[PDB]
Curated annotation (Swiss-Prot):
Gene: E
Lineage start: Viruses, Duplodnaviria, Heunggongvirae, Uroviricota, Caudoviricetes
Signal peptide bounds: none
Source organism of this protein record: Enterobacteria phage T4
Name this polypeptide is given: Endolysin
Superkingdom of origin: Viruses
Result of changing T26E: Complete loss of activity at neutral pH; covalently bound substrate
pH behavior: Optimum pH is 7.3.
One GO molecular-function entry: lysozyme activity
Length: 164
């Protein structure tokens, strides 16, 4: 299992513009287009993102291209972030994937706000950090996905995704 397979389990694949758990306009493999309520603003972002007139619909191909860019940006964002970098460097390969997953879903900023959990992950206090991560809007709003990520940080193995 790898980061791409992991995120693809969590995000799914949709070739037509759709709404987030959050009600936001998205397409592909969790590629948020706009936080704006107009389908029209979303369509415009889409064509800008793809470089063609898409009319709200993309190919598998285009979806994976956006996915490659998004993953790349997430990692680079982690590497550029003063708060995130040190945690990332301290982690093993599997747990590194769990932090990437969080950044992809919630952005650099959002994750950098989990101050106490970050501190615990750096210290390698797995059970403590898992308990603290669960105390969040994140967990309450998308419990099945949060719990997969959390188990991943807890165990350091890919079992939560074995099932799926």
């Amino acid at each position: 299992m790898n980061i791409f397979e992991m995120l693809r389990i969590d995000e799914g694949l949709r070739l037509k513009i759709y709404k987030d758990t959050e009600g936001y306009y998205t397409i592909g493999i969790g590629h948020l287009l706009t936080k704006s309520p107009s389908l029209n603003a979303a369509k415009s972002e889409l064509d800008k993102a793809i470089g063609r007139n898409c009319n709200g619909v993309i190919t598998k191909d285009e979806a994976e291209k956006l996915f490659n860019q998004d993953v790349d940006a997430a990692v680079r964002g982690i590497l550029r972030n003063a708060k995130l970098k040190p945690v990332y460097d301290s982690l093993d390969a599997v747990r590194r994937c769990a932090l990437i997953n969080m950044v992809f879903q919630m952005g650099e900023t959002g994750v950098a706000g989990f101050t106490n959990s970050l501190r615990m992950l750096q210290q390698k206090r797995w059970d403590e950090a898992a308990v603290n991560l669960a105390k969040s809007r994140w967990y309450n709003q998308t419990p099945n996905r949060a719990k997969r990520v959390i188990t991943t940080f807890r165990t350091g193995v890919w079992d939560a995704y074995k099932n799926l």
